[PDB]
Amino acid sequence: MRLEECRKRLEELEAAREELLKVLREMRIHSTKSIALIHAGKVEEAEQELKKAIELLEKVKAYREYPEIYFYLCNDAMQELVEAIAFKNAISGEFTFEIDLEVTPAAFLNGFAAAVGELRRYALTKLIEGDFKSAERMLEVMEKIYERLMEFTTFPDKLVSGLRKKLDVARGGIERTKSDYIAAKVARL
Amino acid sequence: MRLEECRKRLEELEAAREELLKVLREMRIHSTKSIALIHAGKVEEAEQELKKAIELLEKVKAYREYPEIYFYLCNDAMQELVEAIAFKNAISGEFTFEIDLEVTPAAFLNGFAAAVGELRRYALTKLIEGDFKSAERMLEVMEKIYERLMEFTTFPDKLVSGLRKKLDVARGGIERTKSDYIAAKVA
Amino acid sequence: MRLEECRKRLEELEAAREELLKVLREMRIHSTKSIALIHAGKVEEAEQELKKAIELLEKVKAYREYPEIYFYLCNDAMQELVEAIAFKNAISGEFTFEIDLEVTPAAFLNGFAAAVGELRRYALTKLIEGDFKSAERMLEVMEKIYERLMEFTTFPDKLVSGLRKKLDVARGGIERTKSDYIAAKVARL
Amino acid sequence: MRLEECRKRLEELEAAREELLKVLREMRIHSTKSIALIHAGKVEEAEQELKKAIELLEKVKAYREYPEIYFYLCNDAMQELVEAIAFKNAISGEFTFEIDLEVTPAAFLNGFAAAVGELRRYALTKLIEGDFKSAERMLEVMEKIYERLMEFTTFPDKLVSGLRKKLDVARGGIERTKSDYIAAKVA
Amino acid sequence: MRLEECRKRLEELEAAREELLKVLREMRIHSTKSIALIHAGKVEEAEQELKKAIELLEKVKAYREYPEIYFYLCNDAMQELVEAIAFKNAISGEFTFEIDLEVTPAAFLNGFAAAVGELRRYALTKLIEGDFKSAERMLEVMEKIYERLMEFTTFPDKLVSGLRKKLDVARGGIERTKSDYIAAKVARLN
Amino acid sequence: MRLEECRKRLEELEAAREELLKVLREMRIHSTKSIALIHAGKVEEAEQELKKAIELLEKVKAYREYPEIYFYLCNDAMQELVEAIAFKNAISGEFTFEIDLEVTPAAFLNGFAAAVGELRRYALTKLIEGDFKSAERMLEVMEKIYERLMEFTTFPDKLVSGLRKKLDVARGGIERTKSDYIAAKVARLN
Amino acid sequence: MRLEECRKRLEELEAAREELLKVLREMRIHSTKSIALIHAGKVEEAEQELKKAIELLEKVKAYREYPEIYFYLCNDAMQELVEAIAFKNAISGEFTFEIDLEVTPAAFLNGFAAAVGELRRYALTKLIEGDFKSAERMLEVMEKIYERLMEFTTFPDKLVSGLRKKLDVARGGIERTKSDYIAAKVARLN
Amino acid sequence: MRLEECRKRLEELEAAREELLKVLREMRIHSTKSIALIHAGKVEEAEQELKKAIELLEKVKAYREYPEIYFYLCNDAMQELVEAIAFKNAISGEFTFEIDLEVTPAAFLNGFAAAVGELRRYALTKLIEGDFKSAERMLEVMEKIYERLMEFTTFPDKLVSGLRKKLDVARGGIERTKSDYIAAKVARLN
RNA sequence: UUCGACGCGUCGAA
RNA sequence: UUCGACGCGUCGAA
Ligand SMILES: [Cl-]
Ligand SMILES: [Cl-]
Ligand SMILES: [Cl-]
Ligand SMILES: [Mg+2]
Ligand SMILES: [Mg+2]
Ligand SMILES: [Mg+2]
Ligand SMILES: [Mg+2]
Ligand SMILES: [Mg+2]
Ligand SMILES: [Mg+2]
Ligand SMILES: [Mg+2]
Ligand SMILES: [Mg+2]
Structure with a gap:
């Protein structure tokens, strides 16, 4: 019944x-x-x-x-998992897009996007501690994440969650972090 | 990769x-x-x-x-379909909840509730046309759908979407129909 | 700490x-x-x-x-309690504003207001069953609830919850039920 | 009666x-x-x-x-008061979470978070004035407030109101401050 | 300064x-x-x-x-006052459009319009109690208010706030009260 | 350059x-x-x-x-012009979807849907004046407009914009009017 | 009558x-x-x-x-007029809260708060042109307006309407401008 | 029909x-x-x-x-295309305001304005890589775009969509890129 | 008052 | 948005 x-x-x-x-x-x-x-x-x-x-x-x-x-x-939880993983991997100098988890496309993509932010934070505190090497390495994985992830912008936004927005934020972060790098170089003299 | x-x-x-x-x-x-x-x-x-x-x-x-x-x-097309089926069953004296579709719970529930307004419009047309037996029938199934669905209001709104609201509105329709039936019987 | x-x-x-x-x-x-x-x-x-x-x-x-x-x-739960109680009491011909429960003013007031609706429903189905007595008694407790409860309209709405709105709805119901009563009288001939 | x-x-x-x-x-x-x-x-x-x-x-x-x-x-006046207290403690080198008020949990938490922006504006003024030690101090307490408050994000939003958001914004402020401190040090 | x-x-x-x-x-x-x-x-x-x-x-x-x-x-108070005056006047057999208060066109018009429904309520209660004469009178003042007020309905809504909605309600109330009156009239031949 | x-x-x-x-x-x-x-x-x-x-x-x-x-x-004003025309046409005995002056598709459709409500007011005031045949005709046109315009729901919004919402409002109006019409059938007697 | x-x-x-x-x-x-x-x-x-x-x-x-x-x-237009005047005054060396033409209280207050953002644009473009002294003055006026206008928050909104929101926006602008000004202090060198 | x-x-x-x-x-x-x-x-x-x-x-x-x-x-595609053309043109040493497409004033203006930031990104990456000449060039085309585009800022926003906001962003980007350039310049004397 | 839609303006991620 | 808010101007819903 x-x-x-x-x-x-x-x-x-x-x-x-x-x-x-x-x-x-x-x-x-x-x-x-x-x-x-x-x-x-x-x-x-x-x-x-x-x-x-x-x-x-x-x-x-x-x-x-x-x-x-x-x-x-x-989604949210899945995103953070990916984010956290990517983040550890970046600072360990073992960054990969080859994270194998049963997670949704939106969450995978967005987690990687989210890592860019953590990376800016990290690169910035290291910039302050004087460690330019770690900073430029961070920068590099940031630019990598953005550049590779932009390729999925071609999808209707609803399918790909908040990807365009997050990536635009990332891009702004990358520029700020480059400026900071230059500024830190000239500062430390 | x-x-x-x-x-x-x-x-x-x-x-x-x-x-x-x-x-x-x-x-x-x-x-x-x-x-x-x-x-x-x-x-x-x-x-x-x-x-x-x-x-x-x-x-x-x-x-x-x-x-x-x-x-x-x-969701939307589903509950729409359930609405149409329930309405058709009802007008032809074969009303039942037992329909074989599945159809998600909210779609089901909300479809039936949606049917109540259709039943009012029908009932009212019948009234103007003089067919009181038809309006009485419709009134009966409206009442049934309400009494029965109201049991599912125990549930957290999210799981059953707009149910409580759609039911309040239904109740309203049922009362207005009862009134419309009382007038018209004065003829 | x-x-x-x-x-x-x-x-x-x-x-x-x-x-x-x-x-x-x-x-x-x-x-x-x-x-x-x-x-x-x-x-x-x-x-x-x-x-x-x-x-x-x-x-x-x-x-x-x-x-x-x-x-x-x-509130909500409290309201319905009061509503339900008032409702039973009305149809038992023992209606009172002297319901003694540890409940909020807003909930007391609003529960009584809400009963008006149940009462319209009731008086209407009795109107159809031919029972004019029950209907007119319902009508009477309706008008009583409205008239007594309007006295609290003098309060700022936020304190007295949705009281004005509900009472206006009640008033509309009372008029509808009176019309229905007259119509049922003339119908039944 | x-x-x-x-x-x-x-x-x-x-x-x-x-x-x-x-x-x-x-x-x-x-x-x-x-x-x-x-x-x-x-x-x-x-x-x-x-x-x-x-x-x-x-x-x-x-x-x-x-x-x-x-x-x-x-709520609002409360959390505003906590904000003012935390800000004052902070600028005068006596920052602590241990304040004797109570004050509801959300008011407390949210007040501290609100302090972070105030600390940024202060830090930035100090920066323009050349007082780097002050900006360093403020930066330190901003970081502390963030690290420590973030622990309460485990909680259902409702119970702790706007906490997660206000913290995100705080984070933003801390980063912008770190940047503003790196420039200005180039002088 | x-x-x-x-x-x-x-x-x-x-x-x-x-x-x-x-x-x-x-x-x-x-x-x-x-x-x-x-x-x-x-x-x-x-x-x-x-x-x-x-x-x-x-x-x-x-x-x-x-x-x-x-x-x-x-606005609201003024309108409410006008409503009360027009209503009292209606039931005291002294209905007049010549209420001379310093009140806005909006409050005036809207107050009468509002009084229409207060009147429907009144007319229905007399109707129940068998007092057909009272009902007929009320219905007459109702219809007069509607008729006089409907011409201001060409003015821009902001200038005359809720006038159109009020008059809509009035229209319906009039229709319903007429019906009720007639039904009650047949009802008392038995 | x-x-x-x-x-x-x-x-x-x-x-x-x-x-x-x-x-x-x-x-x-x-x-x-x-x-x-x-x-x-x-x-x-x-x-x-x-x-x-x-x-x-x-x-x-x-x-x-x-x-x-x-x-x-x-858009808005063309909608309004269509509404006014459709309405005048309907109360003037010659209702028709043939108004020669266009006007975008959506403004046409929306204007007619809009006119349904004006028709409601008009039928109500006919009812009050006791002209039941007139109110019948109005109900008929109202229903017609609803029935014909519903066929356009299949199209996407935006392209057709407000239509669905308007038509739902209209449906409500029609039913309300039917109810009122029924309430008036106490004449009939006298 | x-x-x-x-x-x-x-x-x-x-x-x-x-x-x-x-x-x-x-x-x-x-x-x-x-x-x-x-x-x-x-x-x-x-x-x-x-x-x-x-x-x-x-x-x-x-x-x-x-x-x-x-x-x-x-309201709106008087606010924009105040904004334009306050702005012109500030970039013209003689900034002052003494603009002789009123105007409601809230439009005055809101106009000045509004002008804060235009000041931000102007200070930024001064910075770009390399005129640091000018940008400094702008910062100073911006800060002044913020300081003085904050003393009006105590009043209820409505009476003051948009002020709190505008002033928050303004605060943001001021800080952003400070940050930009700081970023420019790499000249200084050359 | x-x-x-x-x-x-x-x-x-x-x-x-x-x-x-x-x-x-x-x-x-x-x-x-x-x-x-x-x-x-x-x-x-x-x-x-x-x-x-x-x-x-x-x-x-x-x-x-x-x-x-x-x-x-x-609109959005047209703007995006103009942006791409102006950007490519900028880095190929062939920057020209004479892009002759059948495209709306809004798309045109907005596309160049948009290209400003794409340019800031570019200039920053060359700046990092020690390529000061590329940076200077980019900054020059940036400044030229801002300068010629700022006069359309008197047109009503709806006629020239997001132009104001875009130019605001541009202003800031210019300011920052100048600073970055100078900082990097001092940075390479060591 | 409450809500939604359109148009007109101004904000913000804004 | 595109997105979110504010105010004016229209129109509908409760
Ligand atoms: Cl570290
Ligand atoms: Cl029973
Ligand atoms: Cl072309
Ligand atoms: Mg994160
Ligand atoms: Mg349906
Ligand atoms: Mg109930
Ligand atoms: Mg503060
Ligand atoms: Mg009243
Ligand atoms: Mg209309
Ligand atoms: Mg401005
Ligand atoms: Mg771009």
């Missing part, structure tokens, strides 16, 4: 949404903690927090058997 | 989105025509449009392999 | 909000069921459901020790 | 709301003046305004007997 | 706004009161309220010297 | 635009006035106003030379 | 309103033009445009006879 | 909109590509893209027969 199939499926969904949300939130917390740790210098516990995030990502992936919901609310 | 997998999946999703949209639009056009036809008397021709809509729905059932879209896209 | 007092109080609040919301939601379900039952004729199980509501209201009142939140989210 | 109890409570609540509003407005005026004064150099006079604000806050502490309002009304 | 002038004029405007709002709200309370009394049957008490209201309008009038704020603020 | 031709075209468009705006505001005002006037039972005067409107429409059509701005701007 | 006087005043207000609108749109256009012109380094032409604006302000002030509509409407 | 005419013109407009959008988006893709290539150093491949784009514009031009829709639709 159809109404009871409704009631059933709605109870299932309410439950799933609650649990999923819990998991996704824990994942996000670990991603964020990871990023902050990397800014702080502690890359070891950054890798720890990261591993925690990914295990939780398997737990998250468990809920794909609820297509309605799922995709409407995975 | 990862990014290339992205590119490929986005090319697919774009294509799909476009065709799904086209098909959903056809489906909706048929649903709508069926409804307007029932209002116009042409109840059999209405049945034809409904049949078409349902076939097109078989064609829509293809795209669930794209869950990244699909639901988001299908 | 202040930050820890923050963290503590926020964990407390998140919890309380969750629980409170559950309780309130159950209360609302019983109120609503009560009302529908009364429309259906089954006033006995209406009184049952009602009693369930009120016990749950004691449970609700438990959370007053969280002033922030609480008042931001009690 | 119930309804009369309602009438009474509403008369009280109205009176209170009016008074509370007046007092909060006073408090906020003093907070604001204290901040602008610190920006202008007059750091002691600023201290005076801050003292006034806090006394007025003792007067505000009366109205918690009206929980039906109070919080809703107090 | 233009900033100090700003400060002066702003202080005055602030004060005036507080006082004016307090007065206005008293006037509106009294008007609403008198209308409710009229429905309630207590026409003398209604008269007293109407009187305290009209008394208040003299106080309100003092604020014309602040034209920024004055016309924006006075 | 291109920058030059830019400055030239730009100046031309500035001036045209200002004029086109003035003329459109006038045309729109006269159309509205005409409809209001019909409702105020001043049919002749309404005729005059509609004349002034249609005469402005030629001054307007002069600006098709500037397609960078003509279609973007002309 | 009151309905009569209504019709009269209403007609008067209709006509006045249309004219007042036309004159305000003009005055506003000329003020904006003047500011634009200064930025385009055409200072004399900007002088002309400002003249045309101030001359329209008298045509405008004729309408104070209609306080039902005067203050509601004049 | 006016409804059937509506249906016809609407069908045509719908089709045209689909086709046009497809074309426009191809042109835009190509322009964006050519710009990215220019930054990437691959100026020949950039030239090829620019060529495919300009080829497309000939297709786009065919849609002028649908003025409803045409001008609303073509």
Whole structure:
């Protein structure tokens, strides 16, 4: 009797949404903690927090058997995961676009985009500490991310989430960071 | 090469989105025509449009392999179709909740609630025409749909979308119809 | 250390909000069921459901020790409780403004206002069943609720919730129901 | 007679709301003046305004007997006061989270975050004036406030209101300040 | 010293706004009161309220010297007062379009238009109670107000605020009240 | 030298635009006035106003030379002109979708949909005057317009813009009017 | 007979309103033009445009006879006129809050707050031209206006309307300008 | 039969909109590509893209027969194309304001204004790589664009879309790039 | 008052 | 946007 199939499926969904949300939130917390740790210098516990995030990502992936919901609310957490990963990889001098996760296209793309910001932050504090090498390396992975990711601008925005906006922000950041680099060079004399 | 997998999946999703949209639009056009036809008397021709809509729905059932879209896209046409089916069932004395489609829960629920206003317009036409038995029937199914759907209001709004609102509006319609029936009976 | 007092109080609040919301939601379900039952004729199980509501209201009142939140989210449930009660009392021919519950002024007032609608629904279906007595008595409690409640219009709206709007709706309903009464009289000949 | 109890409570609540509003407005005026004064150099006079604000806050502490309002009304003036306190602490080398007020959690958190912008404007003035040690200090406390507040972002937005946003904006401010400090050092 | 002038004029405007709002709200309370009394049957008490209201309008009038704020603020109360006067007049067999107050064209027109529905309410309650004569009278003043007011409907809405919506409502009320009257009339041949 | 031709075209468009705006505001005002006037039972005067409107429409059509701005701007007022025409046509016994003067597709469709509401007012006031046959005819045209215009929903918005929303409003109006018409069927008796 | 006087005043207000609108749109256009012109380094032409604006302000002030509509409407354009004047004054070495022609309090305050941003553009283009002293002066005035105008926040909005938002924007502008000025201090060298 | 005419013109407009959008988006893709290539150093491949784009514009031009829709639709692509052309021209030492395309004043002006920032990016990357001569050249074309474009800033915004904001950004970019250049210059005496 | 849509202006990421 | 807000001017909804 159809109404009871409704009631059933709605109870299932309410439950799933609650649990999923819990998991996704824990994942996000670990991603964020990871990023902050990397800014702080502690890359070891950054890798720890990261591993925690990914295990939780398997737990998250468990809920794909609820297509309605799922995709409407995975993105943010997924983005940060990618962001955090790319970010660690950049500062470890092992940056790759070859991150293999069961994540949505929008989230992959956008996570990479988001890393550009963290990179600007990093490159800027290193600029201040006098470490021009790390800065110019950061710069380089930034420009790489932008340049490669712009290729997906050709898609209708709705499919590719907030990609054009984020990339325009990135571009502004890259210019600011280059100016800062030059300024830091001339400053330190 | 990862990014290339992205590119490929986005090319697919774009294509799909476009065709799904086209098909959903056809489906909706048929649903709508069926409804307007029932209002116009042409109840059999209405049945034809409904049949078409349902076939097109078989064609829509293809795209669930794209869950990244699909639901988001299908909602409106879906609930439209449920509306048309419920309206047709109702006007022809065969009203039931037991329809075989599936159809997402919100689409289902919201379709039935949507039917209530259609039933009011019908009921009111019948009233002007003098057919009181028809208006009484419609009134009965309106009342039924309300009483029954209201049970699902326990749920968090998000999961069931606009349900509570659409129901309030329905209630309003039912009352206005009861009034319209009381007058007209003064004739 | 202040930050820890923050963290503590926020964990407390998140919890309380969750629980409170559950309780309130159950209360609302019983109120609503009560009302529908009364429309259906089954006033006995209406009184049952009602009693369930009120016990749950004691449970609700438990959370007053969280002033922030609480008042931001009690209203709706409280309103319906009052509404439901007034509604039962009207159709039992024992209508009173002397309902004694620990409930907010806005909710008391607004619940009574809301009853007017249920009453129009009721008086209308009785109008159709031929029962003019019940209808005119309903009408009378309607007009009573409006006239007594208008006296609180003198307050700034924010304090008295959606009172003016609801009362204007009520007034429209009263006029519609009177017209219906006359029309039902002449119809029935 | 119930309804009369309602009438009474509403008369009280109205009176209170009016008074509370007046007092909060006073408090906020003093907070604001204290901040602008610190920006202008007059750091002691600023201290005076801050003292006034806090006394007025003792007067505000009366109205918690009206929980039906109070919080809703107090939020803005509260977080503004926390902002002024944090800013004053910071500019005078005595920055700490340990302030004795309470003050609701969101008001607290959001007040500190709000301080970051004030610290940027200050830092930038100091920069133009040549006082690098001051900008370094401000930069340090901006960084601290960010690092520490960010921990509270775990919480559901509602409970902590605009925190995540105000922090993003803060981050932005900190970066722009770091840039402004790198230039100016080229002199 | 233009900033100090700003400060002066702003202080005055602030004060005036507080006082004016307090007065206005008293006037509106009294008007609403008198209308409710009229429905309630207590026409003398209604008269007293109407009187305290009209008394208040003299106080309100003092604020014309602040034209920024004055016309924006006075509208609802003025309209409400006009409504109460036209309504009371209607039921006392003394209906007149010659209400001579210092009030805006908007408040005047809108007040009568508003009175139309207060009248529908009245006419329906008399109709229930078997008092057909009262109903017929009310319906006549209703129709007269509609008829006289419909010509201002060519003026730009901003100049005559909600006039068209009000008159729409009036139209419907008239239609419904006529119907109700006729139905009740047949109803009392049995 | 291109920058030059830019400055030239730009100046031309500035001036045209200002004029086109003035003329459109006038045309729109006269159309509205005409409809209001019909409702105020001043049919002749309404005729005059509609004349002034249609005469402005030629001054307007002069600006098709500037397609960078003509279609973007002309919409509202052309909608209003269609509404006024369709309405006059309907109450004048000869209702038809054949009004010879275009006008963009969307303004035509929107204008008719809009006219549905004016028809509602008119039918209501017929009902009040006791002219049931007239109100019947109005209901009929209203329904017709709804039925024919619904066929255009299939097209995308933007291209057709406001239509869906307008038509929903219209549907509401029609039903409301039916309800009122039913309420009046107590005559019939007397 | 009151309905009569209504019709009269209403007609008067209709006509006045249309004219007042036309004159305000003009005055506003000329003020904006003047500011634009200064930025385009055409200072004399900007002088002309400002003249045309101030001359329209008298045509405008004729309408104070209609306080039902005067203050509601004049706001925007009087704000733009203040902005243009304050701006011209500042870049012309004699900045002062003493501009002799009023104008409502809120339009004055808002106009100056508005002028802060134009000052930002100007200081930026000075910086580009290498005139650091000039940009310094601009920074100083900007800061002054911010400081003085903040003292008016205590008042309620509405009375002061847009001020708080404008001033926040202004604060942002000032800081941005400071940052730019700092970035330029690499000259200094050469 | 006016409804059937509506249906016809609407069908045509719908089709045209689909086709046009497809074309426009191809042109835009190509322009964006050519710009990215220019930054990437691959100026020949950039030239090829620019060529495919300009080829497309000939297709786009065919849609002028649908003025409803045409001008609303073509703006962003046209602007993007102009930007790409002016940018490529700038780095190839062949900068010219004489770009002779059938394109709106808005697209033209806005395209150059847009190119300013693309230029700032370029100038900064050469500046990093020690190529001071390229930077100086870029800064010169930047300043020339700003200077000639600033006079259109007197035109109403709607007629010349985002021109003001674009030029604001330009101003700042110029200011920053000058600073950067000077800083890098001192930086290479060590 | 509340909401939405269009046009006219000014902001902001703005 | 494009996007978000403000105010004027129109028009519809509650
Ligand atoms: Cl570090
Ligand atoms: Cl029953
Ligand atoms: Cl060409
Ligand atoms: Mg991040
Ligand atoms: Mg339907
Ligand atoms: Mg209820
Ligand atoms: Mg501050
Ligand atoms: Mg009234
Ligand atoms: Mg109309
Ligand atoms: Mg300006
Ligand atoms: Mg670009």
